[model samples]
Target: TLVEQILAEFQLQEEDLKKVMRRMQKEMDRGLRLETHEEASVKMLPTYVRSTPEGSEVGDFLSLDLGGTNFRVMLVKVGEGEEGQWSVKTKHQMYSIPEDAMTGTAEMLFDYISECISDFLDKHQMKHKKLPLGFTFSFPVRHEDIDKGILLNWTKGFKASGAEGNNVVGLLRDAIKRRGDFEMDVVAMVNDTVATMISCYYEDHQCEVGMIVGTGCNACYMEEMQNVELVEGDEGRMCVNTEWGAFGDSGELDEFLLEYDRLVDESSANPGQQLYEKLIGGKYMGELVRLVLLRLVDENLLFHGEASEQLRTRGAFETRFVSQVESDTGDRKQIYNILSTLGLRPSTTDCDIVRRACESVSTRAAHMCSAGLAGVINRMRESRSEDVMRITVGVDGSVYKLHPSFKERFHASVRRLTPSCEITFIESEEGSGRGAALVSAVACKKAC
Candidate 1:
């Protein structure tokens, strides 16, 4: 009867069911805590000072978003009315950085970006005199204020020369000044997570946490002045961005993170941490599953010692492939087809193992995601704030959006962690494109 039910539910065999459940069990043991709340009680970042004349009055501005895969540029025109009232027109162009460029001189990358900007401006017929720009740089950085950020380390496999530990805003400004011959003012330079927070808060007043779960993982939440002991002289501020990605640094990793996770850390720019992220982020999720499969093979779990040679290859699988298998609701035929795409031949038992592995990894990623959210909520409740207690968390990234189980697990995790606090997860509207434009309006004193 259990086999019949599973077959009807997932359209798969009993063998597949056993594999899936086992994988999920392993994930739960690896510190995947999924809980979420229902009340809307989060706060947004103060990066978008809406009281400024330009932000309040509404105007057109340009925004540039530089993240892992693509670089996007847009022009947003805010209309005169209530807050967040605006019209946006945007165009995007993508260029893949050569492997050499990651470790190449900063000038090479900035010059490339400058060329893209020049082309965009030229095509739009916009005047180059004193245009306000917002730059979204996706990396940890030391911020001097709203308009300046110093690079902390390069992630997303980027290792640009002459860029680390340098002021990114200065590099971009210099690039623009030297290459484009266009006079553009860099009004705001904010992290992608912070920009998402500002953008989401502009739409939903209750948003408090801004999270990025795609190529990388990071979270930023508003903290009260009295609670933050690291900074001085500012005890009454409403919001301070906390780079919580670097939080768990006591070498207290769970069992699943033995050698594979440690190797990733030692090879990373910032070693010995972000073990959790390495498990979930884009760069590592598929690889984790692959490693597990290889181990199962060595133990004779699949293919009867004829496991496809492709399976032996390293870094051959991706999260999307695993997602496909988990989403398949058919017989072993679909499972077999999915394996074929990954260059693997699956016997009945092997198919079971692969399907189970996918389920386990997904469940694990979702659980850890929930834990991060829970940490934020716990911190917020500890702070005695009288302003609106209801909050919303603004979330961006393909993993959170595309993965159906991740959202449910996260919400469930919140409910478990904070029974009293009300929270909601709001999807970010336009990302850093609209956010950059909004901050530019504030910087120009137009939002007032």
Candidate 2:
């Protein structure tokens, strides 16, 4: 009945639905290859070198996570003389960066962050000078080691001047020192994906892949030393950090990408990471869906001759809208209200249009994610000669957590490709702040 209403209202043939599905499948395959190529080029680190038993000691440390939209600060009290066993005390503050501040000076940004840290420390009275701090700088960095990384380029709409190519550790340390306040050593610096990997591996032993799906999308996984041709050292055992966003350089794109993906590439901070992220990540999902709808409208696909003026606004369509439509409860009236909130006039026919668009976009994203996972699984299978393949993927971000159909679609894709492998998705127990703190603890223990 819904399909009939949509068809009558929009003058769409059944073939259009079939074409969208096919386009989704094509993009998914391309995404898999893109992920694989990127993974192959990265150099893994040896952070998880120690595989000791439970209750192993990882002394107390402090962590700070400066990610998109929020700053999380936590004081983790790790028990002494315990291996792989530790508890955490977390305190977080969400601060919205003013539109002008995102492109402001590094001094302004770090000063604000330092103030937040100082406030947290003052409130808690944590005055251990010897206590090391882990700083999780969520932007792209060119790291010389775990403790040092130079800012390469800012993403997620951050354009802090004088920060590009500067040592990130130095910037933060200078901020703290300038305040003339409490003294804390900077021990480690890492990205959100790497931090997620460490946290997931700490809890779930099977975790091999870590993914961040909020604001932007990125994934990291452990790879063998032999497979890494980039690392100069002859380290026998090490895991590399693969930047999976730069996948798909081989020039393969699906129909959806050919049609709707150009806008994202042209609009993104770095067009190089275009196709890999546009199909699955949070930053582009709403925009992609909107573009598709606009195209359909221009082709007379919706509301007969209705113009898609409302959908032209940035971030006008969100993936959460998709999740609600997929729920399809008896109270369709609420769905209409939700559409109104998104600036859409949702008739019965319009509801079908919204639902179909969500389904198509979400299905495509999940399938692409699965294909990337499969590529990792395949690589793992070849590297590890175990008879039974098992891998755990650590997942974070709103789309993965809140979307009901996303996990199911991802699982279906994995099942289709890797029937023999035992795969599981693990939510990271610790936020980026805790992971940063844990890294600091690891560094302190190493120093001692």
lDDT of 2 by residue, 334-435 (tens): 568766776667678766776677667777777666666666666676667667778888888777777777887677767666656888888877757666
Candidates in order: C-alpha RMSD to true structure:
8.1, 5.5
The C-alpha stretches of model 1 lying farther than 4 A from their native spots are 1-57, 83-89, 127-130, 229-232, 235-239, 254-256, 266-273, 307-309, 332-334, 384-389, 446-448
Query: CA lDDT of 236 in candidate 1?
Result: 54
Name the TM-score of candidate 2: 0.83
List per-prediction Cα lDDT, in the order shown.
0.63, 0.64
lDDT of 1 by residue, 139-168 (tens): 766666567767766766677888878888
TM-score of each: 0.82, 0.83
- The superposed Cα distance between candidate 1 and the true structure at residue 291, in angstroms, equals 0.6
Q: How many collisions per candidate?
A: 35, 13
